[PDB]
């Protein structure tokens, strides 16, 4: 039986680091793992196409969705059927936070599109590394994709993630990303222990 | 005002030929015209890429849709705002025909996706060059697939009869071109 886990948060939150550490932990326990990420896990060329000038938010979401559709069908679902713990650094939630709450695309449309794109595949758990957007922005420069975009954009993203976590409190594990790195890794692993076992 | 026209049908139906005939005819009259096409009219790199190993139909449609979203916003709407006749060789109907009726993706989903992608922009007329696959294949995935696509096109046309001008694409090119011009005549300017 596979297990689908995701990690989410602003760039700089630590989700990338924690995704890697979790993979390495499970590998040390003899468990097969697939460590992946969006965007690019399905169609790597979408990472390039996402640097098109003045790209509409709609087309941006649809390109992310095409990538995610391949990601689910070619990478994630086969890994799960193979019994792996498939860990994605970003999944659907990132599109809802960034393109929904961030860019203002209507959420019902985002979800109508995602319904087939994902085949309804949802993570068993999702680790949200939460922290203030001012704090995120100081840790690391933004993706080339997200320049111009100001503090208020990132606030809407941060709050959107938190609204997603409120609606799906069983799925979302919200962690304070200003805790020490070891403490976040400890908490992630504590959440996973009864599942892996 | 501007005028949005599309051409549709199987590859090898004469759709591209007629698209070009129509543009040339409008240029000969001194009528501003923009000839474009899908896929590639919005994001050319979607065309190049498209050739990806065993690409899911869902992902394919989503990529077409990203292309189509940029096409409508950056190319077609400005053209129409300039008072041009904008002619697209393929538009939404192609994705509905091929991905929907052909590959079996659910039609209501396809249209949910399209509603924002196209901002609701529909062609004033859509010339469907209808013919059997065998005739199309003669000129340029099984036969059964192409039949499903052809029949889907006819189902679209029956649902939207005012918009679809169904033409028998086995007729001589000139007779088709003359027909297309006759359908257009009262719309200009
Ligand atoms: Cl990060
Ligand atoms: Cl989800
Ligand atoms: Cl801080
Ligand atoms: Cl939940
Ligand atoms: Cl053709
Ligand atoms: Cl349409
Ligand atoms: Cl109609
Ligand atoms: Mg990190
Ligand atoms: Mg960890
Ligand atoms: Mg997620
Ligand atoms: Mg999606
Ligand atoms: Mg906790
Ligand atoms: Mg003008
Ligand atoms: Mg059309
Ligand atoms: Mg579309
Ligand atoms: Mg037909
Ligand atoms: Mg109609």
From Swiss-Prot, chain A:
Q: Could you list this entry's UniProt keywords, alphabetically sorted.
A: ATP-binding, Kinase, Nucleotide biosynthesis, Nucleotide-binding, Transferase
Q: What species is given as this protein's source? A: Thermus thermophilus (strain ATCC 27634 / DSM 579 / HB8)
Highest taxon, organism lineage: Bacteria
Parts of the chain that traverse the membrane: none
Which stretches are annotated as coiled coil? none
Q: Please state what the protein is called.
A: Thymidylate kinase
Molecular function GO labels: ATP binding; dTMP kinase activity
Q: Name one GO biological process term.
A: dTDP biosynthetic process
From Swiss-Prot, chain B:
**Name of the top EC class for this enzyme:** transferase
Q: Give the reaction(s) catalysed.
A: dTMP + ATP = dTDP + ADP
User: Which branch of life, at top level?
Assistant: Bacteria
Any one GO CC term of the record: cytosol
Question: What GO molecular function terms would the record report?
Answer: ATP binding; dTMP kinase activity
| EC numbers on record | 2.7.4.9
Keywords assigned by UniProt? Answer: ATP-binding, Kinase, Nucleotide biosynthesis, Nucleotide-binding, Transferase
Task: Write out the function statement from the record.
Answer: Phosphorylation of dTMP to form dTDP in both de novo and salvage pathways of dTTP synthesis.
The keyword Plastid is assigned to this record: no
UniProt KW tRNA processing keyword: no
**From its record, what is one biological process in GO terms?**
dTTP biosynthetic process
Q: Which protein family is it in?
A: Belongs to the thymidylate kinase family.
Q: Which residues does the record give as ATP binding sites?
A: 9-16
Return the protein name: Thymidylate kinase
Mind giving the lineage of the organism this protein is from? Answer: Bacteria, Thermotogati, Deinococcota, Deinococci, Thermales
């Amino acid at each position: 039986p596979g297990l689908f886990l995701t990690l989410e948060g602003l760039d700089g939150s630590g989700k990338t680091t924690q995704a890697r550490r979790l993979a390495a932990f499970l590998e040390a326990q003899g468990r097969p793992v697939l460590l992946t990420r969006e965007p690019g896990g399905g169609l790597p060329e979408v990472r390039s196409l996402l640097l098109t000038q003045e790209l509409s938010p709609e087309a941006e979401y649809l390109l992310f969705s095409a990538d995610r559709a391949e990601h689910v069908r070619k990478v994630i679902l086969p890994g799960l059927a193979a019994g792996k713990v498939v860990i994605s650094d970003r999944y659907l939630d990132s599109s809802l936070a960034y393109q929904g709450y961030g860019r203002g695309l209507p959420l019902p449309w985002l979800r109508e599109v995602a319904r087939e794109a994902t085949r309804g595949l949802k993570p068993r758990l999702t680790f949200l590394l939460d922290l203030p957007p001012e704090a995120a922005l100081r840790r690391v420069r933004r993706p080339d994709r997200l320049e111009g975009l100001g503090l208020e954009f990132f606030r809407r993203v941060r709050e959107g993630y938190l609204a997603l976590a409120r609606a799906e409190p069983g799925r979302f594990v919200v962690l304070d990303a200003t805790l020490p790195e070891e403490e976040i890794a400890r908490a992630i692993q504590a959440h996973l222990r009864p599942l892996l076992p």
